[PDB]
Design a protein around this ligand. Structure first.
Ligand SMILES: Cc1cc2nc3c(=O)[nH]c(=O)nc-3n(C[C@H](O)[C@H](O)[C@H](O)COP(=O)(O)O)c2cc1C
Ligand code: SF4
Ligand code: SF4
Ligand code: SF4
Ligand code: FES
Ligand SMILES: [Zn+2]
Lengths: 181, 117, 240, 209
């Protein structure tokens, strides 16, 4: 309906003459049909070897990029600012349970806090031991959700769906394919 | 003309084709391999074949030597070899030449020799 | 040691040293010879006190300015390795080490070089750039590359073959040179540009806007649309 | 008799009185350079080993800063990361456009060095251009295109001190500095060709190869 049928004088096609056009309007399935040949003095003129637009053409560029004075490279660097591959042992998750988090730590006594760190960093405790050690609020805070629900397998950008159905659909009913979007 | 085909037998090609070039008869590289070596190597796949319709591609060492040696008013010359008709970036890149020593100095891409005067 | 600071030494042993310290600032103490020149009435050199106003200096002990206190445009305290003080600061500034560093500048050798308003500051700084080009040794890659870079920048700025961005391009090149030299000559090479940048930024633009309709428009780097490389040298561009 | 300090968190101990760049080599933190060398005298001409030093007003060269205890060496200060791009860019405004004809194509120390730390662009687009240097005939062994030289002094200190042919030398100030005899006379010490492995650009290179 914004992309519906348009008549054949806006289709850029070789067309017809005028008594044969009057013939073929009476003899066609739809009159608004192109015979497929593009129009010769329009399509591919002037040839790409001779384009007057191609004579002056320096460079496409953007303003914070081509700015000579202000930026250095290292602010607009992108290859050396990659995120690190965050790896997690079995053991460091036990560290995340009992020692706590940078949001909510559970550790004072920064001298002996290193000692409480290090045996777990050497394998003093086990994970299931920490699970029994972890409180109900600990499990429902940093393992499950606040209702104690399992986290849904998370998605980048969730795309909710419409179903276009009516005359804006690409097939009417009877045809089995629907056109959701 | 007549060169020995490794057996005392001589092979006989005209002097129009004992040539490095239509512009030059002599070689210009240490491992140039003159045509007198080449027909000596494989005339096996050269028999029953025309001698005319091979390239003979007009070697460059004769053509560069008859270009006029240009003059530069100041000290440091610039060479591009780029046309001023072609809308683009052609020629060799913008290197500079010091011309101070007695004698001309070829721009190491284009081979045009420049002189300080 | 400076010949001056060792030639003052016998007198200051002969006189009172704290008596010498009874002058100027607490720290910036005593006297200095002031080689005062530029466009004055009386080019002279006086042995006078530190921490003194420039106006009382010039108006009383070097005659005046050719065209008066109006006709100054800027002043260079010290040698050439000092940024130019503009008109509003130079009226009420002491000649010590403190106030000039406070206006981000050096007292130098306390030569005073005043500048005619009816003359060209861009010539005055371009000559300093080529002064440094004749007198860089060549240990530092920054200094040796720097001053021949600065010189062609200043010539292009003098005729006006630049764009408006390129003056701050030069400012970043100034601080590129500044802290990265073995001897302090790069520090010397830096500051006369920064005086021009901080105090004459529309003044350069007036020359450049003038050049923009003297001839056709210019691209970056001085290249014009007809500035081309023909047989041998370049053509089109009028060679700063 | 040894000194332990900190380079980028890495504590490292090295013999006293040595150079900081050897401590950076010992710590494993790679610091680029152009005119340091082990077997040669130390000159700070290259300006590449700039590095941040606690208790220092400005970043200093790591080649000639002597090792002092209680040292905190930082290499990734944004001032230093600015500085390396700066100095590379300053070096690359008189070096000529010879990368497809220069001999050290993949072996240009400068070039691989200018890929990590070089600028995107280079704003040399001045009209009247770079300097340029005489051919400087030396001998039938050493190919010589002094235009590509950067005066990194690494040739002349060697032929001075260890090779013992003191004919090489620096003549002139600024861009009028050259390297070599301006007699145009033949160099020979009995290890003559060792400079073409030593000039990190292809200013001096191999004449038969
Ligand atoms: C490039 C440069 C050039 C200098 N030229 C001079 C000079 O010509 N006469 C002078 O007395 N000091 C000159 N100085 C400053 C000297 O280094 C100065 O003698 C020293 O730093 C301090 O000496 P003093 O205690 O006697 O003031 C120059 C400094 C630099 C960085
Ligand atoms: S600042 Fe001094 S040492 Fe460095 S290159 Fe310039 S003149 Fe030489
Ligand atoms: S030394 Fe310079 S010109 Fe030669 S290949 Fe390396 S970067 Fe290119
Ligand atoms: S001759 Fe070669 S190694 Fe020596 S300073 Fe010059 S470019 Fe460097
Ligand atoms: S070797 Fe460190 S500055 Fe040249
Ligand atoms: Zn050329």
């Amino acid at each position: 309906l914004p992309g519906g049928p348009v008549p054949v004088f806006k289709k850029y096609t070789v067309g017809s003459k005028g008594i044969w056009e009057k013939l073929r309007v009476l003899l066609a399935i739809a009159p608004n049909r192109s015979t497929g040949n593009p129009i010769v003095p329009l399509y591919r003129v002037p040839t790409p070897g001779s384009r007057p637009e191609a004579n002056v053409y320096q460079d496409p560029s953007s303003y914070p990029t081509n700015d000579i004075a202000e930026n250095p490279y290292w602010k607009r660097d992108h290859r050396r600012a990659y995120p690190q591959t965050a790896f997690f042992d079995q053991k460091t998750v036990t560290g995340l349970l009992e020692l706590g988090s940078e949001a909510t730590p559970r550790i004072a006594d920064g001298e002996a806090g290193t000692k409480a760190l290090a045996n777990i960093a050497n394998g003093g405790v086990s994970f299931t031991q920490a699970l029994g050690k972890s409180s109900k609020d600990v499990i429902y805070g940093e393992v499950l959700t606040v209702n104690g629900l399992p986290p849904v397998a998370p998605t980048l950008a969730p795309k909710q769906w419409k179903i276009i159905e009516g005359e804006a659909a690409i097939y009417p009913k009877g045809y089995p394919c629907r056109t959701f979007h | 003309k007549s060169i020995i085909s490794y057996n005392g037998n001589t092979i006989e090609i005209p002097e129009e084709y004992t040539k490095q070039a239509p512009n030059r008869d002599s070689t210009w590289a240490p491992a140039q391999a003159s045509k007198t070596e080449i027909y000596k190597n494989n005339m096996v796949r050269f028999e029953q074949k025309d001698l005319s319709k091979q390239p003979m591609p007009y070697a460059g060492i004769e053509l560069i030597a008859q270009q006029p040696v240009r003059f530069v008013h100041g000290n440091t010359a610039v060479c591009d070899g780029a046309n001023h008709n072609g809308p683009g970036a052609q020629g060799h890149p913008k290197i500079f030449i010091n011309v101070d020593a007695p004698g001309s100095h070829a721009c190491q891409y284009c081979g045009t020799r420049y002189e300080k005067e | 040691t400076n010949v001056e600071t060792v030639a003052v030494a016998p007198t200051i042993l002969r006189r009172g040293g704290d008596w010498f310290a009874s002058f100027g600032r607490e720290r910036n103490s005593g006297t200095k010879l002031f080689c005062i020149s530029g466009n004055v009435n009386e080019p002279c050199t006086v042995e006078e006190e530190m921490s003194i106003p420039l106006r009382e200096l010039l108006e009383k002990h070097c005659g005046g300015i050719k065209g008066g206190w109006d006709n100054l445009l800027g002043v260079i305290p010290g040698g050439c390795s000092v940024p130019i003080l503009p008109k509003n600061i130079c009226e009420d500034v002491l000649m010590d080490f403190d106030a000039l560093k406070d206006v981000q500048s050096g007292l130098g050798t306390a030569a005073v070089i005043v500048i005619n308003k009816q003359q060209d500051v861009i010539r005055a700084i371009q000559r300093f750039a080529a002064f440094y080009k004749h007198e860089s040794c060549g240990q530092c890659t920054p200094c040796r590359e720097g001053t021949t870079w600065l010189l062609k920048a200043m010539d292009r700025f003098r005729t006006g073959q630049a764009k408006e961005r390129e003056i701050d391009m030069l400012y970043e090149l100034t601080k590129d040179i500044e802290g990265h030299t073995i001897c302090a000559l790069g520090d010397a090479a830096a500051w006369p540009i920064q005086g021009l940048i901080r105090n004459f930024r529309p003044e350069m633009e007036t020359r450049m806007k003038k050049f923009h309709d003297e001839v056709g428009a210019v691209s970056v780097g001085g290249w014009m649309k007809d500035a081309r490389v023909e047989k041998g040298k370049v053509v089109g561009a009028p060679l700063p | 008799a040894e000194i332990e300090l900190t380079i980028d968190g890495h504590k490292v101990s090295i013999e006293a009185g040595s150079a900081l760049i050897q401590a950076c080599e010992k710590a494993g933190v790679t610091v680029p350079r152009y005119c340091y060398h082990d077997k040669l005298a130390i000159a700070g001409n290259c300006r590449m080993c700039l590095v941040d030093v606690e208790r220092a007003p400005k970043p200093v060269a790591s080649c000639a800063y002597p090792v002092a205890p209680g040292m905190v060496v930082r290499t990734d200060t944004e001032r230093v990361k600015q500085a390396r791009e700066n100095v590379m860019e300053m070096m690359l405004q008189n070096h000529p456009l010879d990368c497809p004809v220069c001999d050290q194509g993949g072996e240009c120390d400068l070039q691989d060095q200018s890929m990590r730390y070089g600028r995107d662009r280079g704003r040399f687009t001045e009209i009247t251009g770079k300097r340029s240097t005489e051919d400087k005939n030396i001998g039938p062994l050493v190919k010589t295109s002094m235009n590509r030289c950067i005066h990194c002094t690494r040739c002349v200190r060697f032929a001075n001190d260890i090779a013992g042919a003191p004919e090489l030398g620096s003549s002139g100030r600024g861009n009028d500095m050259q390297i070599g005899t301006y007699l145009e006379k033949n160099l020979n010490t009995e290890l003559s060709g060792n400079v073409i492995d030593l000039c990190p650009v292809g200013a001096l290179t191999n004449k038969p190869y």
